[PDB]
């Protein structure tokens, strides 16, 4: 089997992308954030504290196929310190025509304020490895893990757009979706992430520096976070750029034309256009813009987020030995 779904930026800045998911019988459609940085399927629901609800909710009691998962609970927090918790049902879940029965659907009893504040995201769909799932006492498999037995091929691809819709595909590779050939690189699952090592970087039309950059492919993260020296090397090529404490990152005049950024994938090269790195003005009408490449120093991990991934066609190969594939598009 296969599935194909359209993914849309939640705002004009491509802060995040939401993909429609059908849950339950008859189907309830929710807009979930597909997150390759986590492994929990959780949604806003009829069980969520009402003052914490502003989103479309899941109502388990309206689904004929929902089943309470007795004694199971979950609790999760993310990179930005936001969090949610609750109990667990299994239900039928469909994405772009691909249907999984008995999928664990984590029902939120409580959510942090940033989740309440964002009206466009109804929940998250985790696509990292299942060892990161927070359900206890027994961890639950991700949507991808459950689908693998039925997929034509054990893969999914991300094709995220710049200020435009994109596609998530399951179980097949759309050869009309990219140019050139796909380059595959090995994945480490030791920490449960789609973790890989880039072979180096170039700024604009300068030289490619071979240097290992271990990082994770995280569709749930907006920007590109790289080691400080790499990031310094980039912004040095932007004459009015500087680091801003008040803002917490590099900023530059919105009028500047930004250099491209290239990262290595084995012997291949992926070029992020300068325009993708112009993330947006710090406030509407402002003459200063926020940069899309920032230091990973206070995070502890390098993160290849949407800024980076939307410049490529990305293949998440979930075979027993998983790999990452990148193509130019």
């Amino acid at each position: 089997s296969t599935g194909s779904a359209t993914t849309t930026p939640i705002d004009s800045l491509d802060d995040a992308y939401i993909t429609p998911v059908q849950i339950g019988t008859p189907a309830q459609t929710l807009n979930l954030d597909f997150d390759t940085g986590s492994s929990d399927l959780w949604v806003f629901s009829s069980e969520t504290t009402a003052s914490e609800v502003x989103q479309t909710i899941y109502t388990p009691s309206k689904s004929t196929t929902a089943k309470l998962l007795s004694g199971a609970t979950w609790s999760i927090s993310y990179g930005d310190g936001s969090s949610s918790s609750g109990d667990v049902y299994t239900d039928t879940v469909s994405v772009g025509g691909l249907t999984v029965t008995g999928q664990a659907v984590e029902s939120a009893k409580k959510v942090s304020s940033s989740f309440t504040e964002d009206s466009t995201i109804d929940g998250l769909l985790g696509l990292a490895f299942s060892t990161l799932n927070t359900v206890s006492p027994t961890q639950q498999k991700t949507f991808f893990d459950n689908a693998k037995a039925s997929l034509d091929s054990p893969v999914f691809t991300a094709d995220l757009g710049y200020h435009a819709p994109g596609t998530y595909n399951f179980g097949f590779i759309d050869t009309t979706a990219y140019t050139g050939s796909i380059t595959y690189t090995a994945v480490s699952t030791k920490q449960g992430f789609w973790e890989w090592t880039s072979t180096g970087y170039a700024v604009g039309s300068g030289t490619f520096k071979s240097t290992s950059i271990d990082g994770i492919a995280d569709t749930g993260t907006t920007l590109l976070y790289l080691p400080a020296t790499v990031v310094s090397a980039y912004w040095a090529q932007v004459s009015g750029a500087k680091s801003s404490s008040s803002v917490g990152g590099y900023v530059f005049p919105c009028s500047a034309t930004l250099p491209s950024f290239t990262f290595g994938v084995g012997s291949a090269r992926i070029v992020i256009p300068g325009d993708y790195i112009d993330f947006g003005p710090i406030s509407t009408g402002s003459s200063s813009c926020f940069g899309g490449i920032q230091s990973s120093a206070g995070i502890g991990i390098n993160i290849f987020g949407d800024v980076a991934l939307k410049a490529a066609f990305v293949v998440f190969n979930g075979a027993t030995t998983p790999t990452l594939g990148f193509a130019s598009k």
Binding site: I10, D11, L13, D15, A16, D33, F34, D35, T36, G37, S38, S39, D40, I76, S77, Y78, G79, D80, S114, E117, D118, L124, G126, A128, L132, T134, D218, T219, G220, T221, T222, L223, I299, I303, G305
Partner: peptide, 8 residues
Amino acid sequence: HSLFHXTP
């Protein structure tokens, strides 16, 4: 709407 960092 914020900037998003999806889990440690």
